[PDB]
Amino acid sequence: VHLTPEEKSAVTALWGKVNVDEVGGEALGRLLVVYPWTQRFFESFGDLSTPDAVMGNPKVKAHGKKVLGAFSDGLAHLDNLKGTFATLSELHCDKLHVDPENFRLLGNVLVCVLAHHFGKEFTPPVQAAYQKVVAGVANALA
Amino acid sequence: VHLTPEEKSAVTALWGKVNVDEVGGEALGRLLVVYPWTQRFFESFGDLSTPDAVMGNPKVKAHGKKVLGAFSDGLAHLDNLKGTFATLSELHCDKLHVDPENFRLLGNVLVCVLAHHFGKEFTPPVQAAYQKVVAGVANALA
Amino acid sequence: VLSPADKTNVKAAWGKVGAHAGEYGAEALERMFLSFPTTKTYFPHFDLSHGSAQVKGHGKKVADALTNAVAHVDDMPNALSALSDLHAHKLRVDPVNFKLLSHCLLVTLAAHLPAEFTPAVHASLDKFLASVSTVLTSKYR
Amino acid sequence: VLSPADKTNVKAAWGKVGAHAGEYGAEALERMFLSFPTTKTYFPHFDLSHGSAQVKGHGKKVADALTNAVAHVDDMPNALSALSDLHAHKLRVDPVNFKLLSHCLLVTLAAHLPAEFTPAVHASLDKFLASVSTVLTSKYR
Ligand code: HEM
Ligand code: HEM
Ligand code: HEM
Ligand code: HEM
């Protein structure tokens, strides 16, 4: 996961404009709605029974924020991603088994949510930089 | 990739009984046969037009051996697997520049051919030790 | 797109399995649970140790679902309708897990049918198991 | 597999795309070629740089294949018959790559239709694209 400076620029230039308080919840919500089997990994998380139900379930929105944090943490330490998400997957015991594909799906959902919030600004090369990131972070959680 | 000692016993014991010269060729042919798209990465290898053909093709059989060779060397270099399939992916330029999934398909096919040759000796615990291995390897090459 | 020849290879391979139906289903489960331990979260209320009455019983249940698909291979969606619902809606099974069992099922066949598990028969059983797995996941799509 | 309300959501979403059809297929391809660079091996005889006339035409070919699936959503295998054949037999496309284009297409719509890309609509578009990909890859199964 070596990002070139242009890749680094693209990711961080956009990630400062991010409504941190909400985009995590948008991303985690849309995952539980678009890929329903992911609800199994929560549903001990309130009512997860509709788009609307999920989009405004408080523990969704709250854990969205952690997800976004987790991500910025990957940003600041690309070259050592397994060592940043070390105590992360560890402090979860056995809540982060799932299969690495659903980390990749979460990361693609986030990409969809960024593009949704930035439109034209989320250009194809900006996407490519983020895909590199989501990729390395996914594979870290493993 | 931590193999336990009994996982290690399982793998190595079976692995010495293995007729190297061709189990590799059996596993690479079944790949081109079971998942046809993978022929695109060869077909320079000659005719890949029927089960019978792929199984017979000489370059299939030859690279079967190389493939088995890569495996024994991952067996002898688990904890820094990346630090072993480095020369491997590098000397290929952009020949292993394909989705990680297909490295995992090759692994499973091999597991099938090992079970095929060892029947009852390929117990579920022996299989599981080998799944750990193919996984670390695939994640190394990519 | 199961061709006439995949259908022939699958009915064949199956027939040889014979009554070792459930047994081979049990072993596939056991292979799955040891090789892919994430999968064990779906069976918390099971004992998953060797010789489990519960893995035998469910292994027989999975083998008969499969036999049913074989037996109704041209109308698998209707045949597996209720199982599509169970796995997708009810149990919320991650779709990846069907690739893992399918593979433990082909490993188990390989190990018990060294004569029947030719390249051609392997490819047709894989196509068959991918078609079943597609149905069982079709209430996600 | 596709509910009446998926069908409504997908036809709605294509509605707003309007004539930006080909364009958005072009851009989805470019997102795929830049984000998933293995995919470029399928297009060697293509110049894949920004504003390629070739990525626009192909991008318009892909956009009309999909509009055709939408128009014939209840019989996609017959509709997409000839493209199933193209993609699996002639071109031997790796199935994983359909998941990648699908994602780049969902990302392109997200970027061009902020109001229409509700969670519900995103789900439906994901399901529609998964059914199309299942068709395009069905002559492997
Ligand atoms: C999938 C990506 C996930 C990420 C990135 C993530 C992130 C985090 C972070 C950063 C923390 C520490 C911060 C803090 O404690 O305030 C934490 C703790 C925690 N995580 Fe997660 N988590 C994920 C999935 C899950 C799942 C699936 C569960 C349970 C079903 C879960 C349950 C918890 C709990 C209970 C805590 C500590 C207490 C709490 O705040 O609820 N997480 N997680
Ligand atoms: C995917 C798993 C693959 C493995 C494990 C593998 C293994 C190897 C190894 C170990 C060598 C060096 C031989 C030695 O020093 O003993 C080699 C060389 C080579 N590889 Fe591969 N390879 C793979 C895929 C491919 C592909 C897809 C191609 C495409 C044509 C390819 C083409 C070649 C060629 C032409 C050589 C040099 C000539 C030869 O020794 O055959 N390989 N490979
Ligand atoms: C070839 C693919 C599969 C077939 C044919 C199949 C078949 C079945 C059948 C027939 C039942 C009903 C059993 C009964 O009535 O007692 C069932 C239930 C169940 N299936 Fe599957 N299944 C498949 C794949 C999977 C996978 C991959 C998982 C999860 C990893 C899974 C998890 C379950 C669970 C948890 C139950 C309920 C267990 C219980 O409470 O008894 N199945 N399946
Ligand atoms: C939604 C999924 C897809 C659709 C609707 C689609 C559609 C099409 C169409 C309509 C054509 C015919 C174009 C013509 O005759 O000029 C075509 C050809 C082609 N498709 Fe796709 N395709 C899809 C997925 C893919 C993927 C994932 C790849 C590769 C990664 C791919 C690679 C190709 C290639 C290489 C050609 C031939 C290029 C040429 O020589 O002009 N397609 N596709």
From Swiss-Prot, chains A, B:
Changing N57K: In G-ferrara; unstable. Changing W15G: In Randwick; unstable. Changing P100R: In New Mexico. Changing D94N: In Bunbury; O(2) affinity up. The modification Phosphoserine is found at S9, S44. Changing G25R: In G-Taiwan Ami. The modification N-acetylvaline is found at V1. GO terms for cellular component: blood microparticle; cytosol; endocytic vesicle lumen; extracellular exosome; extracellular region; extracellular space; ficolin-1-rich granule lumen; haptoglobin-hemoglobin complex. It holds the Pfam family Globin. Changing V23G: In Miyashiro; O(2) affinity up; unstable. Glucose reacts non-enzymatically with the N-terminus of the beta chain to form a stable ketoamine linkage. This takes place slowly and continuously throughout the 120-day life span of the red blood cell. The rate of glycation is increased in patients with diabetes mellitus. S-nitrosylated; a nitric oxide group is first bound to Fe(2+) and then transferred to Cys-93 to allow capture of O(2). Changing V18M: In Baden; slightly unstable. Changing V126G: In B-THAL; Dhonburi/Neapolis; unstable. Changing N80K: In G-Szuhu/Gifu. Changing L31P: In Yokohama; unstable. Involved in oxygen transport from the lung to the various peripheral tissues. This is Hemoglobin subunit beta.
From Swiss-Prot, chains C, D:
Gene3D superfamilies: Globins (1.10.490.10). The initiator Met is not cleaved in variant Thionville and is acetylated. Keywords: Acetylation, Disease variant, Glycation, Glycoprotein, Heme, Hereditary hemolytic anemia, Iron, Metal-binding, Oxygen transport, Phosphoprotein, Transport. The modification Phosphoserine is found at S3, S35, S49, S102, S124, S131, S138. Changing H20Q: In Le Lamentin. Changing V1E: In Thionville; O(2) affinity down. The keyword Acetylation applies. Changing L80R: In Ann Arbor; unstable. Changing P44R: In Kawachi; O(2) affinity up. Changing E27V: In Spanish town. Changing D47A: In Cordele; unstable. GO terms for cellular component: blood microparticle; cytosol; endocytic vesicle lumen; extracellular exosome; extracellular region; extracellular space; haptoglobin-hemoglobin complex; hemoglobin complex. Gives blood its red color. Belongs to the globin family. This is Hemoglobin subunit alpha.
